[PDB]
From a paper:
In the present study, in order to elucidate the pyruvyl transfer mechanism of Pvg1p and also to understand the structural basis of its substrate specificity, we first determined the crystal structure of Pvg1p at a resolution of 2.46 Å. The purified Pvg1p was crystallized in the presence of Zn2+. Diffraction analysis of the crystal revealed a structure in which two Pvg1p molecules formed an asymmetric unit with two-fold axis (r.m.s. deviation for the 328 Cα atoms is 0.16 Å). Approximately 928 Å2 of the surface area was buried between the dimer, and it was stabilized by many hydrophobic and hydrogen-bond forming interactions between three α-helices and a β-sheet (α1, α6, α11 and β8). Because the predicted active sites were located far away from the dimer interface, the dimerization of Pvg1p seems to be not essential for the catalysis and substrate binding. The crystal structure of Pvg1p consisted of twelve α-helices and twelve β-sheets, and two α/β/α domains at the N- and C-terminal half regions. The folding pattern of Pvg1p resembled that of the type-B glycosyltransferase, including sialyltransferases. Charged surface representation analysis clearly showed a positively charged cleft situated between the N- and C-terminal halves of Pvg1p, which is suitable for the binding of negatively charged donor substrate PEP. In the proposed model, only the D106 residue is situated within hydrogen bond forming distance of the O6 oxygen of the galactose residue of Lac, whereas both R217 and R337 residues directly interact with PEP. Based on our predicted substrate-binding model of Pvg1p, less pyruvylation was probably due to the steric hindrance posed by the NAc group of the LacNAc-pNP with the H168 of Pvg1p, as a result of which it could not bind properly to the active site of Pvg1p.
Residue numbers in the entry:
A (entry chain A): 54 to 267, 283 to 401
B (entry chain B): 55 to 266, 285 to 401
The structure:
């Protein structure tokens, strides 16, 4: 009953509506495109410390569970991929009940040839199945790399590409839109819905958390942490005998608790921004890169969460601190 | 009972696609019309184009489904009255009233009057929930784009809805700094499957060529659905609703008179899809008048017996014959 953002109740209603909209669109799109599917192989599981990519995995599980679809196989990298093992797993499954699902996020571009290569390997071993991605960021600065990657999608018109932001959508359409369906949906993590439970369960350890690149102790009676949520990793994730699911769950929960430790967050990471929004943690986001790592997504989907006490975007970390103080005297956290 | 009876398996795929588009329209507009009870429709198409009138009826249908009443309609500047609209909304709470821009292809170089009416209405009535029905949007001329951009920059509350990929990309680059821009299906898909009017209309010709070999035994008509107009639409004492309804129904019956349609019009293509009439679509222009929309939304209706796109009218005839011997119509 109570607002997601306590301390900014009227503005909270607008962002809660926006969360619900994104969650419904995800369901509506994926219910349709997974019609008839009962079992799925997940391709490109993020077996590495990035908290946002693991949160993407958990939200993918949640959506698949909501559609009564079972994950019967997972591959992270080429090294752990086995065509024989996957061939045997799907031998007993009717063709129209099985799909290939590409793990979403920012794994489609110049910097991610291994992720693309795994997609190529799996689709060519198992062609003519319902094949679709979870919502991706997509961009190639280099034509040569784009031309290479385009052959897979041209030769397999059944593959449906899902993008999560307007710039990725426009790029995907121009590059692959002749042969493949291209969609624009929200980021899958919004299917988790409001998750204030974890905000309330986690004890507050600092007043502010700075999850961004850089110091200045403006002593307005506020403690702060300048930690990075990359690098460090839950011990369970470091275990080789642990399952993919265990690693992804642990990394998601760890990342969520990490943000919950503060009353306000300053961040330049998209999924620190997304998760804080879902948990009802007030936060300022810093767009300090070119490209648009934050702003491409934000301007596509989150206009309704762009409010005082909820979430705001600024062009620098110094601007974030200034606004933080206004929020403090306003009592937004 | 399939929508496309002579292509039952392929019909299922296109019916799903219709349902998807209808649900997205509802989901988006339910959200963005939250709290709204009454609406003024701006840019009503008071002219013979059948597709634009079909857009109007679908707009009515959606508004009715959200329990929203249309309390005012303006087609052109000549019939617009600020005083009349001001008095109509005087007793309505601010947050219960919205301005709704009539959708379709009325946003670009060729449509300065449509844009001008939008400018007039928003500046007389600023700070209301303001949103468009799904539009096609493109400006070839920078000078015209720059002029039209001022309205949307000065009124950040306006939400722009586009109906295709290219329009969305254009709208985003041009207006995306200040305004929300959406990509939804074309509003006419909220009508859902309408085979009733296909079944009610008697077949007059075998083929209808609605665009710019004969025997083996196929009759054909090369009519244009512009120009001619139901007599009720020509009546000045008729209401906007009557004209729009009549023009929609007339356009629908016109397509229903054939067993197959060849067309180069987007809404002949859309309506034929909804009615379950097999048809071939011809993309004979440069702009992508058909293909921008089709490739955004209708991959699932791109099947034999349902609907196919080709680059010329000659190609359409060739495929028609394959469909005839297959028995797709
Ligand atoms: Zn004028």
């Amino acid at each position: 009953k109570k607002p997601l953002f306590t301390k900014s109740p009227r503005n909270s209603a607008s962002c809660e509506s926006t969360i619900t909209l994104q969650s419904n669109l995800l369901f509506t799109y994926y219910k349709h495109y997974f019609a008839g599917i009962k079992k799925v192989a997940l391709i490109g599981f993020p077996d590495h410390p990035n908290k946002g990519d693991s949160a993407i995995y958990v939200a993918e599980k949640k959506l698949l569970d909501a559609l009564n679809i079972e994950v019967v196989y997972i591959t992270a990298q080429e090294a752990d991929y086995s065509a024989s093992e996957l061939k045997s797993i799907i031998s007993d499954i009717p063709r129209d009940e099985f799909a290939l699902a590409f793990h979403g996020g920012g794994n489609f571009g110049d910097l991610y040839p291994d992720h693309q290569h795994l997609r190529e390997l799996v689709v060519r071993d198992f062609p003519s199945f319902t094949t679709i991605s979870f919502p991706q960021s997509v961009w190639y600065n280099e034509q040569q790399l784009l031309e290479q990657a385009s052959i897979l999608y041209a030769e397999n018109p059944n593959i449906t590409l899902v993008t999560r932001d307007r710039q990725s959508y426009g790029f995907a359409v121009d590059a692959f839109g002749k042969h493949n369906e291209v969609l624009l949906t929200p980021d899958i993590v919004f299917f988790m819905g409001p998750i204030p439970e974890i905000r309330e369960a986690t004890p507050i350890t600092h007043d502010v958390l700075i999850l961004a690149r850089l110091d200045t102790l403006n002593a307005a009676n506020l403690t702060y942490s300048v930690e990075d949520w990359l690098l460090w990793d839950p011990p369970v994730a470091q275990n080789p005998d642990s399952s993919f699911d265990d690693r992804g769950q642990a990394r998601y929960e760890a990342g969520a608790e990490f943000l919950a430790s503060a009353r306000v967050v300053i961040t330049d990471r998209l999924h620190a921004h997304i998760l804080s929004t879902l948990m009802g943690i007030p936060h300022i986001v810093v767009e300090n890169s070119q490209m648009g790592k934050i702003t491409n997504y934000h301007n596509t989907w989150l206009h309704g969460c762009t409010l005082d006490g909820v979430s705001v975007v600024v062009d620098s970390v110094d601007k974030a601190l200034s606004l933080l103080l206004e929020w403090n005297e306003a009592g937004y956290f």
